[PDB]
Amino acid sequence: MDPEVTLLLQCPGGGLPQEQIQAELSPAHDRRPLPGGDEAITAIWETRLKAQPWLFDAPKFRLHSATLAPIGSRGPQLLLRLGLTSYRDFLGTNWSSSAAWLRQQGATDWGDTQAYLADPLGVGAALATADDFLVFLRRSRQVAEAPGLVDVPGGHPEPQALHQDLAGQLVVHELFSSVLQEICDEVNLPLLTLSQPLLLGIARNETSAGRASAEFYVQCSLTSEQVRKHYLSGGPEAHESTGIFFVETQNVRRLPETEMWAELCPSAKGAIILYNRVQGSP
């Protein structure tokens, strides 16, 4: 099995487009204040700044829950319940040495293992080329998280916009746009060579206390050879990764049985499992 990844949601229909997804952004969906107070988060942050004074905080979307409509129905097919969190809150909760204690306290107090966790929502992509390969990236050995492991394109999108209901559609547009922007920024591809994303589902990273990522399918009009040229033509300062490579979609089907599987970070494992279940499997 793979204990570091769990599926929260698998989408129907081969994946959902933007127009079929509703978001509810509400302070009811935020992390709950820690039992001893949020001063523990402030302590971790001030300690970190006194070692690396150039770090900066950033806002993030928080995933509270998601609910699928009955399969085959008319109208919107998914509701995402979102709150707001931050990089600082993430470092103080999901990335804390005591994250597992916070999950137990959450179960006890709120019947929710995630109630005291920041749980910022990540995004990632199963990115397919015109000659039927998926795109993979090799992570730097010097970063804090999953050093030297294999990833897919992705990031962690950031809130900003100037009625609580209609604020929803703008959030859904920002999530889908962010997936494409991350592909442009890291893979160095033109925006116009990319299809609109489809949402495949949501996966949780159990090595980061259950933090979730939305996993998408994106098609590119360029061949693998052309994508490699674009990636490399940026130079070492144009990408965080140190290398790119490609696997035939034919072979992705049995990836969990290869030696590559042990090298894949948890969010990339989630993207591949969801691609195989939702775009593969005829």
Q: Residues within the annotated binding site for substrate?
A: 56, 87, 139, 144, 151, 156, 158, 267
Helix (H) or strand (E) holding 82: strand 78-86
Q: Are 24 and 80 in contact (CB under 8 A)?
A: yes
The C-alpha atoms of residue 220 and residue 125 are separated, in whole angstroms, by 12
* 70: DSSP letter: P
Detail the residues annotated as belonging to a binding site.
Answer: 56, 87, 139, 144, 151, 156, 158, 182, 186, 267
Are the C-beta atoms of residues 207 and 265 closer than 8 Å to each other?
Answer: no
CB under 8 Å to 206, separation ≥6 — which residues?
Answer: 3, 4, 5, 6, 266
End-to-end CA distance of the chain: 23
- Rounded Cα gap, residues 32 and 18, in angstroms: 29
Structure tokens at 60: 């993030």
Q: Give the integer Cα–Cα distance in Å for 135 and 129.
A: 8
Binding-site residues from annotation for Mg(2+): 182, 186
Q: What is the widest separation between alpha-carbon atoms in the chain? A: 55
**Rounded Cα distance, 60 and 105, in Å:** 23
Cα 76 to the chain's mean position, in Å?
22
